[PDB]
């Protein structure tokens, strides 16, 4: 029913997750009801073989902050089948964050949420700091992006 969900193809597809970011990465699998499920994390510069399936949807996040990362230069990874026996690579990288978002990341990394509103900054930035990245926000945006260019 949710458009962004894995399909139960039951068709094995071997993938290699390759973390080419400086972040500890959390692979996130969107299950058949479109709910996110975590898998074990990947240290920077580490690769790992995974047994996945045709049509299964994956996202990748900073394991500690949930910032979004790219996989093969886009936000969603969906394997097809292994071509002539070769593993499918999912190359995970850092996006070029806006300077504002990167600043929000660094301030969130240094200040407890309960203290955001004690910071002496333009007050619109309080809600910006509190609007933490998260998978469901991105799923909403990605879904309406999909229907928008679908029409």
């Amino acid at each position: 029913r949710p458009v962004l969900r894995s399909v139960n193809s039951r068709e094995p597809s071997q993938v290699i997750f390759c973390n080419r970011s400086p972040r500890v990465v959390l692979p996130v699998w969107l299950n058949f009801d479109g709910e996110p499920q975590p898998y074990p994390t990947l240290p920077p510069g580490t690769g790992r073989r995974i047994h996945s399936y045709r049509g299964h949807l994956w996202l990748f996040r900073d394991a500690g902050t949930h910032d979004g990362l790219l996989v093969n230069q886009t936000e969603l990874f969906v394997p097809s089948l292994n071509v002539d026996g070769q593993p499918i690579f999912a190359n995970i990288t850092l996006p070029v964050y806006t300077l504002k978002e990167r600043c929000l990341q660094v301030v969130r990394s240094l200040v407890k949420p309960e203290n955001y509103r004690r910071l002496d900054i333009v007050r619109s930035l309080y809600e910006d700091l509190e609007d933490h990245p998260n998978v469901q926000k991105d799923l909403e945006r990605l879904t309406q992006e999909r229907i928008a260019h679908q029409r």
Binding site: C18, N31, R48
Partner: peptide, 17 residues
């Protein structure tokens, strides 16, 4: 049918990528 979720192979070893 049963749903088949992704899984990590037991003989898998992390490597430098």
């Amino acid at each position: 049918l049963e749903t088949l979720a992704p899984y990590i192979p037991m003989d898998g070893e992390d490597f430098q990528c």
